[PDB]
Symmetry: D2
Subunit: 292 residues, 4 copies
């Protein structure tokens, strides 16, 4: 009552960060960001990018859907649901005064909020794409492409920007005690990597400490796990309603250039990220509500 | 629409630092990179404009307002889809020397005004109808999610490159003169000035839209879009009142209020056509 | 300083068309010069991509130096001097505000002029290096001299964004007539970045050009132009890192001999203009405050 | 074997760009446009606390800072520092070290680009701090002394102005960063953390590496000899300003400052003026490691 199970993953995650991405991969990354209308490339997508012929082909097959009005709406309703869920389930104290007291100015606190907005907007879109990748491999099915409201096929609300990449304190940038927030987060969220979200927050170390410290107790409360299940279900639902059909099976993966062992590995990797992203959506919603 | 009043818009490149602060809050809230000529003109009646924005902002910050603006964009895209067959111009433009990247730069520009103009239409409606009627618009608790914060990403920098009328040269003044004639306006909108950064492109897009202007299908769409704007006003999440009397406590004279009313009425009428005109452009480009 | 004969077609590759291979060179040229546009000079030479890449590889080490910064800066200074004395130049800040321009608009205009005032001497010296290298076969520079000449140049610079330029296919009816006038008056087959960047404000360009035009090819002008050219040739004789790039070097780079002969004609056209363009911009900028 | 001595102290109250109201932001913006730099110095933040002095000293110094002379005189302080540190120190590259720590080539370039900013701008702040301090201490009028007309020409005009460098402020800092900051403060003998080190702190592991390599050189005789030389260049520049500068105690009083305020400012500008010679040397060192 009522919990989302963490998939087994013993495969090594090998994300290709934007600052290491070669010219070819950089072009794909850029088209993703333009399509999603986000200034960063998700770690989810960095890790998938390792298996590059798969990534390119699964991107090419999913992009016609991510361009649509439906995707914008369906992602946005996931942001709404998280706001709704966390509000009702939690007493979230504002932290603005506490930050002001630690010496943060008004300009700075708005800067912090702007960074929270980036991830509040983008993560839903990454959740659905990860659901498409993971379920397309596991099931071999084709998803969406149904007739429906023509308006679902219209251009999504045009926004921006690709630029710049948010300032993120990477793990090799860290940091000493910052590595230990990083380790705590890792232990607590049960992950082997630190999310883009927390690395952006890490440009203000004392702020991350504060925000993460107030979120931690909520993690894996019954209301948290229940809400996480709901977030995930809504991503499954979005998958079945894509305006342009999506299929990317094991055989598609093999035809794209992957070995059997590679495809097995990918399946674990995408599975952990897809699981992860339900929580990440909730976590950012909390951060944003603290900062009102 | 009846108007004899002089329109006295304050450009962002002239705005003083007190007004520039309002402008900036308008831009962050709407999530757009330009201050519309609508609001430029209303800023002249500065006391009213700061009070009106005070009262409208809490609605504009909401989920409701975001969807309601987006649904106007959707509707316009629908209407111009049906009522007009509109040929791509992507090939003509490459024939003229424009490269792929340049054509994407043009699109990115249209996207701005395609996203924003609905937000300025709803605000213009709220100003006009509030003055004319003294009614309090909106305020219902209804669905809670309507009061949630809007989709947060946007971009407010840079100000788009606009070729102002005093920048303009010989023939560009003629394209401007035609546009002011055809559209019955005494000013050139941001949109066309922004397009005029590529003058040959503007000539080509204007000439393709110009025949559509006062056709019965256009007038009908323009009525439809206007209706939706009126409907959005009726459903603002935070109440909005700003009457003739309210304008006084803001610091306007009755005579200035009467001038104000004529000014907004012209702009509010204008924004309907602007939303359509832009849709058309965007459809021309792929 | 007579215009050279150029019957060859100029085929510049603009930044919005450059493939990712060329674009990477372009970005290195920009970071090195510390400027935010790639010169048409560079665009035209890049058509001969094999040569262009080798020539930049060889010219880059001098361009990174304190010497090169100083020697480019000293040309800007000299041009400022010459136009100060040889011409009576009229403040026009007042007509502009009269024409409708706000003070921040006039400021944006100055910032644009500043870019070309800074950068063009660097392009002049480069074009001179390419030209004399092909014509003479000689190795230029390489002396140890004063060690401080080989130190890194003054680091600060802006390379984003690309200036807004109204290209010849962007242009409307009248704007093609201004461009026509300029290409005629200056004896050029193309429109320089500079004027295209001023063209962002069409009425302003009409004015600034109208004021410069009666100075072109006056004896004082031609004399200054001779001086600016002479200073570029001297900058070449004093490069910190040796620069050789001969006709023979162009073959070994991957050009044919016919392509080389065409290149010589092209670069000679540009190298002759760049002295002219340096004074033109000085004039524009003295028109502002 | 020669040293520049540091003077004594009062309390420093810098007004950072993110707190600055909009009157002050307007002066800050003209400063940066005139210097051609993306950051307002802590030197000038601290002086901005005494706002009508700051406003007036800036108004008097700016005509000189616009000139070709200033640009050159600043640039030569940078060159001399590069010369100085080169000749006097066995300074090893740290690029292979960083890459081993996991830093990529794009990242190391980003770090250089940040080092470039302060290597350019600090000499200009040094000269201005020397003008503020000596003008108060002496009552004298500096420069204006009609020489080469080319000295009065506009300076080299391109400049990087509008992204303020990402700086990890003290109240941003978390734990071990505060102790690095403490080490720096204690070693450089300062009660504040320079913009430079805070910009470097966007990459904590890099700051620790770069700072740790520098720390041995600080107050070697070669360091101090060099620091004295940097300081002399700054005094020399002051006497050759093309537009005369005077800003005395009574200039300060007539601007709205009290006697006690003026005494305080004097101690504050003296500490910053002293600091800047060392900072010039410290950045030169960082930048040579990163070759």
């Amino acid at each position: 009552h009522l919990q989302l199970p963490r998939p087994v993953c013993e495969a090594i995650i090998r994300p290709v960060p934007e600052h290491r991405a070669d010219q070819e991969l950089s072009e794909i990354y850029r088209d993703l960001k333009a399509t999603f209308g986000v200034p960063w490339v998700g770690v989810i997508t960095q890790a998938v990018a390792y298996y590059r012929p798969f990534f390119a082909e699964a991107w090419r097959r999913f992009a016609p859907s991510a361009k649509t009005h439906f995707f914008e709406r369906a992602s946005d309703d996931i942001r709404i649901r998280s706001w709704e869920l966390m509000g009702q389930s939690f007493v979230i104290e504002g932290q603005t005064d506490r930050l002001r007291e630690m010496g943060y100015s008004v300009r700075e606190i708005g800067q912090i909020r702007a960074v929270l907005d980036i991830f509040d907007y983008g993560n839903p879109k990454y959740l659905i794409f990860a659901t498409a990748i993971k379920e397309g491999l596991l099931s071999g099915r084709t998803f969406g492409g149904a007739a429906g409201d023509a308006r679902c096929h219209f251009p999504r609300s045009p926004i921006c920007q690709i630029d710049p990449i948010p300032v993120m304190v990477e793990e090799h940038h860290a940091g000493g005690t910052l590595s230990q927030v990083y380790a705590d987060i890792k232990q607590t969220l049960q992950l082997p990597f630190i999310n883009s979200d927390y690395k952006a927050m890490a440009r203000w170390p004392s702020y991350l400490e504060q925000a993460w410290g107030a979120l931690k107790p909520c993690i894996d409360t019954p209301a948290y796990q229940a809400g996480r299940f709901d977030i995930n279900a809504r991503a499954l639902a979005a998958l079945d309603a894509l305006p342009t059909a999506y299929r990317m099976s094991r055989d598609d993966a093999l035809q794209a250039g992957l070995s059997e062992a590679q495809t097995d590995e990918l399946i674990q990797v995408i599975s952990l990220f897809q699981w992860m992203l339900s929580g990440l959506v909730l976590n950012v919603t909390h951060f944003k509500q603290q900062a009102l």
